[PDB]
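Homework-ish question, so no full write-ups if that breaks the rules, but can someone show me the predicted structure for this set?
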Amino acid sequence: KKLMAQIFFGPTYYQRLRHMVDDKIHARARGPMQVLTRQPVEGRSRDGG
Amino acid sequence: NEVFSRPEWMILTCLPVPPPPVRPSISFNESQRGEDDLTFKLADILKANISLETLE
DNA sequence: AAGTACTTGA
RNA sequence: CCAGGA
DNA sequence: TCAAGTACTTTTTCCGGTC
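A: Not a homework solution, just the prediction itself:
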């Protein structure tokens, strides 16, 4: 069915940026701990909490 | 306070030595140390003390 | 950048 | 530190 | 004695590289 509205449609130059979900997503539930403080390690990289 | 903090105790005679859990070594590979700064600074205190002790 | 704390000259 | 993200 | 100078203190949201 026709839309009651008319859509502004045409080509536009879009860029793909360096931020992708899969390089961001992270989850932890017990993992590596620091030596000194005996607390969870830092960063996604290190499987930190 | 006569029990917990006499002013004479602001001056150090007998220095407490913290145990390894406070100053752990970063034990890289097998035969390689990696001693904490506190372990180094303590040896500096030890060394300074022996010089003075022998001197007097 | 804005304070306490202490020191210095009139 | 350096570079970046909300 | 009391203005003005001095020292020295203090902070600032959360989340890769190359060293």
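Now go work out the reasoning yourself. Hint: Chain A is about 0% helix and 0% strand.
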